[PDB]
């Protein structure tokens, strides 16, 4: 398969040197191959056809210089040739949509843009629920979390039902779809396919997202992801490079 | 004193008569007189000179119809004559800045606009610390929380230092100052004024904000705030109307 983004780039850990300045005409993304928050930014870069380079950060052995890129020490972080730094996944995505030409991902209409950001807050509980599920130590907690997924997924189903459209912002894929897609991308890998069996519009949306050329170009092995996940929970410095 | 931002409106609770229609050319804000998040929205409405009506919600006796304005059941909520509903304080502020004429509060530059949103994230721990502080009942826990305030205020002082500006978005007042002002406005009332003494530029920004005409027009009694707070902590249905 053709390696996209920074799918083959080994991560930078403790003792790595700070990278050199970003070349003129390019934008750098500090990312992690399996981070859903950094995937939002990689999806936008691909969709808009922005020339970019990827540096992967070993999130379980972070270089001290990374905290100079983002004081929170989290990926994604964008860095341009002027040395400007942009962090927070949603801020990185909105910045790229505004600063570069190509397909316009967010609507200009103030209310429509506000709707995409309100849908993002309707989704906000999913990332921590995904977190609690992966760290689940017994069958009782495990089963209850599946019911929570169904409850949160129903709120998204309601948005699609009212909008009477395939995607969260209309007939075509827009910003909001790319912002929430990295968590749905892993549902099958997490064995959570049953959580969408009472949300038919969201299940059709997932199928339609899998067919998008940008989405499709970034898909990776479900087994590299489970393998990564096992090591990440063990706080392994080898987690972020699993499969390389 | 002269009320120009819903200071005189008794809150609507369970059983109360819901409001009429929103007049054409005006916008409604569902608010609460002492809510710092809804205050961000009131500051933006006043600064831009937007015709608006304030409806206060009794947060400790919430009408069930309010959940149809915002499924989260929180203020602020904007509602126009077309029936569009906008919620989440930061979303309500950006929407008003984009949709209406008057003074521009957010910068035109994509990076400068991204900086405002990253500074809001650097401030994001302050509301939860304020929550914990007001609930503190131990001398050790009281002193400990003050050290955390000092550390969060230092992150804000560093932004002002690096920028060499009076305000968080330049040498003139802008969106970001209004978004964080409602918490600093109350430090004196909470007996936390001394927590800003180690952050000189932050203390001068507080003085400068106090002199802004928009900030000054929304001035309230420190004692009304304190009295409201005691009752709010007791989950009293009389809290939101304190002073009326």
Curated annotation (Swiss-Prot), chains A, B:
Q: Which residues carry this modification: Phosphoserine?
A: 132
Q: Which InterPro entries match?
A: Glutathione-S-Trfase_C-like, Glutathione-S-Trfase_C_sf, Glutathione_S-Trfase_N, GST_C, GST_omega, GST_Omega/HSP26, Omega/Tau-like, Thioredoxin-like_sf
This protein's assembly is summarised as: Homodimer.
**What name is this protein filed under?**
Glutathione S-transferase omega-1
Q: What the protein does?
A: Exhibits glutathione-dependent thiol transferase and dehydroascorbate reductase activities. Has S-(phenacyl)glutathione reductase activity. Also has glutathione S-transferase activity. Participates in the biotransformation of inorganic arsenic and reduces monomethylarsonic acid (MMA) and dimethylarsonic acid.
- One GO-annotated biological process of the protein: positive regulation of release of sequestered calcium ion into cytosol
Has the keyword Oxidoreductase been applied to this entry?
Answer: yes
The text of the family note is:
Belongs to the GST superfamily. Omega family.
Locate the N6-acetyllysine modifications and list their residues: 60, 146, 151, 155
Give expression by tissue: Ubiquitous. Highest expression in liver, pancreas, skeletal muscle, spleen, thymus, colon, blood leukocyte and heart. Lowest expression in brain, placenta and lung.
**Reactions listed under catalytic activity:** RX + glutathione = an S-substituted glutathione + a halide anion + H(+); L-dehydroascorbate + 2 glutathione = glutathione disulfide + L-ascorbate; methylarsonate + 2 glutathione + H(+) = methylarsonous acid + glutathione disulfide + H2O
Cellular component (GO) terms are: cytoplasm; cytosol; extracellular exosome
The chain residues annotated with the modification N-acetylserine are 5
**Which ranges carry the GST C-terminal domain?**
109-233
* Record note on what altering residue 143 to D does: In allele GSTO1*C; no effect on protein stability
Which organism's genome codes for this protein? Homo sapiens
């Amino acid at each position: 398969s053709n390696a996209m983004s920074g799918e083959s780039a080994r991560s930078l850990g403790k003792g790595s040197a700070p990278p050199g300045p970003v070349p003129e005409g390019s934008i750098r993304i500090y990312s992690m191959r399996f981070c859903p928050f950094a995937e939002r930014t990689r999806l936008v870069l691909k969709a808009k056809g922005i020339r970019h380079e990827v540096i992967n950060i070993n999130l379980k052995n972070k270089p001290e210089w990374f905290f100079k890129k983002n004081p929170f020490g989290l990926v994604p972080v964008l860095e341009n040739s002027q040395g400007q730094l942009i962090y927070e996944s949603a801020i990185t995505c909105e910045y790229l949509d505004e600063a570069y030409p190509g397909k316009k991902l967010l609507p200009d209409d103030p209310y429509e843009k506000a709707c995409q950001k309100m849908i993002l807050e309707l989704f906000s509980k999913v990332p921590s629920l995904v977190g609690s599920f992966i760290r689940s130590q017994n069958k009782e907690d495990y089963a209850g979390l599946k019911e929570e997924f169904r409850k949160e997924f129903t709120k998204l189903e309601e948005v699609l039902t009212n909008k009477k459209t395939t995607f969260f912002g209309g007939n075509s894929i827009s910003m909001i779809d790319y912002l929430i897609w990295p968590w749905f991308e892993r549902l099958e890998a997490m064995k959570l396919n049953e959580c969408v069996d009472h949300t038919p519009k969201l299940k059709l949306w997932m199928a339609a997202m899998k067919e998008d050329p940008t989405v499709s170009a970034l898909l990776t092995s479900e087994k590299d992801w489970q393998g990564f996940l096992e090591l990440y929970l063990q706080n392994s410095p080898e987690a972020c490079d699993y499969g390389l």
